[model samples]
Structures are given as C-alpha cells and as structure tokens.
Target: SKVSVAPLHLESAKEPPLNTYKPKEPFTATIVSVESLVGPKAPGETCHIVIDHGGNVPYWEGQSYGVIPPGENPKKPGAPQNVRLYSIASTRYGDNFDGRTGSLCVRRAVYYDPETGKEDPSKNGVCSNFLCNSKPGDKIQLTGPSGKIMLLPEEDPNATHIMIATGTGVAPFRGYLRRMFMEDVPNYRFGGLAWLFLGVANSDSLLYDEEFTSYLKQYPDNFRYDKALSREQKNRSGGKMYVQDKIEEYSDEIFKLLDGGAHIYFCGLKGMMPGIQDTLKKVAERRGESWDQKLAQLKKNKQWHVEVS
Candidate 1:
C-alpha cells in the first residue's frame, strides 16, 4: 500500500527563545579552527571558522552572531569597534556537535572604487577579514545568536524545504541540512524533500560541494542539490547562469512544492530578490495563479522567508 502524502498545514510555532548578548557584555570565544571551504585557486576566499563557547552560549540554527573587530571606532573617536553580524554556519551544538561551540562561514569582503570600478585592497570588511584570517587559539568577542525566522521547523517533521542561496548566503542552509539529515541529531526527523539551489561564480567556488554530495548519496530519497555557476555556465538565452534563472527553469517543480506546503527560504544579495519575484510572477501567470496572493498567503502562514544583506 502506498502512503498518500498530505499537504502540511501546521501552524507556525515559535522556537524556544534564546538569550541576547549586548556589546557591553559579550561572550569571549576562542577559535577552534579556520578552514577554507573554497579552493585556493578560486577567485575569492570563504572560510568556515569554528569557535568554542565553553558550553554556555546556546543558540539555534539560522541565528546570527555579532563580531566586534579589534579596532577603535573612528566616529566616536575613543569608542570600541563596530559590530558586524554573521550567520552561524554550524548547528546549535556547534561544529563538532559537542554543545560547546559554533561556526561561521565568512567570505573575505573586498571593496571597489565605484567611479573607476577598480579594486580597493585597502578598504576591506574588518570583521570578515578578521574571521577569515583567524587561527586556532585566537580569541574574540561574540554577541547574541539572534534571529528565528529562517530556522528549520522542527515542529513540522513532514514539511519540505526549498532553499535558494548564492555565495556565502548558504550559511544557514548548511546548518538546516545538517539538522535534517544527521540521524543522531536530537529533536526531529525529516521525512520530506530538502532541495538546495546554490549559485556561485565557478566550480572552484562551490562551497561545501563535497559534503552536500555525500549527503545526496547517503539520503538519495531526501536531498536534491542544484548549482548555477554564473561564470562557467550559460542559460538558454546564452547569458550567465544565476539562481533566479535556475528557479525559472524549474518553476513548475518549485510551484508544486509550494502547493504542497513546502517552506521557501531565500538568502543572499539584496539585488537578487526583484528578479526572483519577477520570475515567480511569470510562473504564476502561466498557471493562471496570482504570485502576489500566494506570497501573501505564505507570509501569513510563515512559510516564506528571506535574509539578505
């Protein structure tokens, strides 16, 4: 007998609240390890930084940690350094799942002169560079693991998840997938599809490809991994491939997942949203549906989520 899969309609439930740490009072964590997820030959560098919180600073997946670089503030003259928020890439129990650590996936941020469009090597993200270049035993200040919107819905075990990301925006999904597929992880078990659409510049920049591939093999019935390489691949129109283009290409499947009450999460550059919305609009129009209405319904049901910066 075949099981008839019913659509999920569970009400949105709140995760247990996490404590917030302010700048004045922060947790001092030591770096456990820092490893590059991308190839050294890649154009940019993104590192997975593991930090030990000594089993105290508890956090949930999809939360963010604030990093205050070691520097004096220029605005207040004598004030401390400014805080930068980064999404936690590791599960709540941390990198080793030992209940005492966490990790961040950070890309080395570089700036460019808008007028000449030339690289400005001098102007770099203080926190990002600090984390990427950190070594084991290095200590730094960390703030709250804030945010709950993008968390995996442990309350709904049957719900599917459609994740779309570009660059390091895949940070949260890494944790989400680990929680879903790691059989030993407590709290919940996933019984629905977990599709990941990752967009990057090239194959060398495909972060976590090895891990995702292993998961795909291990959970062939549960995971789907897709990639869009803007530099190495082309769309039907011969333009560079992007996440939105991939979304449009597979709009039917995406919409079917949505129709079945799957949760949708978007993360990455702010510029990517408009194109995604436009594609959704066209996809809905072809099906004689209203994308705006569907989006509103999803929002009302807390099924649509976006985290961009």
Candidate 2:
C-alpha cells in the first residue's frame, strides 16, 4: 500500500540533548510563517514556511519532518492524528555558508479526478492538504531528518553531487546547495560537477524558479540547472516526462559521474528513484557490466540514497 500518515497520538516530543546531536527527531512545530507562491499558470498556491519548536529547530540538510495533518483521523478515534514526512528545505541554524534561516519549501497540491471530473481519493497528498488549509500560526507535528543522503561535510571538498528531483522533491537539495556555496568555502568549489534536473507539469508549477535561476547565473561554470515542463509548449519533449526521463538522456555523463564517485540524492516519489536506477543499470549492461552487481555495490557502499515524504 502507498504510504500514508500514521496517526500521531504520542505526547509532546522529547527534545534530545545537544550532546546527543541526533540529526533526526520527531517533534511538534508551530507554524511561524507561511507565504504563497502562486503563478497565473500554476493551478494552486505553493507555500514557503518556517516551522519553529521552542526556537531550536530540528533537522539537518537532506532531512525531513513528519507533518501532522489537521483534524482527527476517521480511522483513529479522538486523536490529533496526521503525520507525514517532508524533507527539510533549510535548517533553522542556516546553511552556515551564509547566515540564512532554515525554511521549508512546500507545495499546496490540488487534485481533480478526470474520470467523472470529481476528486480522486488517491490523488490527495498528505502534507499538501494541511498546508493548503492551515494558516500561518497553526501547530503541526514534525519528524526531523532521518536519512543520511546528505552531502558529506568536507572542507572545500572535491566531491561531485548530482541532484535529481521533480516538483517539491527539490526541498532537500535546496538546503544542501546553499551549504555548498556558503560564503566561507572559497575552496568549496564542487569538485566534478553539480547537476540539477527538475520538472513540473507547467511553468506555474515550477518551484523556486528565480532562486535556482539565480544560482545558475552565479556559478555558470560549476552549477548546471535543467528544467522541463511536462504539460505545456507546442514542441514538448514528447509525452509527460518526469525528471527520470532527463536522467536517461545523460547516461554516459552519469556513468562518468558515478565512476568518479559522484553522489546522487534522489527524492520525490519512491517509485521514480528505482526507475532511474534501472536505467542506469541498463546503461551498465550495455557496457558489459552487471546491473545486479552494481546495485549490490551501491547498496553496500551507500552511494545512492532516497526518501519519500
């Protein structure tokens, strides 16, 4: 079954000690700020939020929070249920490359069932619904970052990072990317390459277009950004292509990046991550390599990482 929010009935989360310093934690966050990013072509509003908990925000780069949904769950009686994971777009402590507060970039997705032109139950997203309905000051539960797919901390590291995401999946990378370019890391030049493949159905659906675009202009030599529109344009890429489709086009380069120990951070739909991995496997097979062996190696080396929110 597709993952849904597990009703949260636990007491207020216990804040772990600073010495423990675990990156991931389950906590209740009060909504401090909520801003909408709505474009004419974008069908719905996207929210940029800052979730606070006693001023000490919880999470790390490439981490997520379990968002507590609004109202009680019909499945669970009399409970403040509704908790779904969401990748942290920023850290409350900022990326440290610059002094920017940790913030969250979340989309408010709306669903329309085409069959009878009614609402599709399966089409409803968990945290998205809460964001669309809640105000700036609402309270919600959250789970801090739980995955180790983050860019390893290095001093002016010589590591290659390729981030592929569709829709709101770009959240983690947004935080990671900022940390990469923080003012102090003059040697922080990304070693091999940094590629970002992002996709949405329409131009309006594009999240953080301006911020990413600005990054492209700022580091034209190292950072590359490629965006695709799945639903618009006369000469489209042929059919609806997710970010994975773009990954296929650069198989050779991808192989090189992987061989050079490039790190891949995959988020969004859990299903999509495997498909991209399969394509890469096919690429390996065509070159007389065993995809199965490679998969095993990746699993062992922990080079590939993924999370779903």
TM-score quality measure for candidate 1: 0.91
Tens-digit lDDT string for candidate 1 (37-143): 88756778999999998866767788888888888887788888988888888776666656678889899998879899898766988889999989999998998
Q: Give TM-scores for every candidate, taking all chains together and pairing residue i with residue i.
A: 0.91, 0.77
TM-score for predicted model 2 compared with the true structure: 0.77
- Residues 153-201, candidate 2, lDDT per residue (tens digit)? 4433666778888777888877666655533333334544577888777
Predicted model with the maximum TM-score: 1
Q: What is the lDDT of candidate 2?
A: 0.63
Residue pairs in collision within model 1: none
RMSD of 1: 5.6
Poorest lDDT segment (10 consecutive residues) of candidate 1: 1-10
Report lDDT (CA) for all predictions.
Answer: 0.83, 0.63
lDDT of 1: 0.83
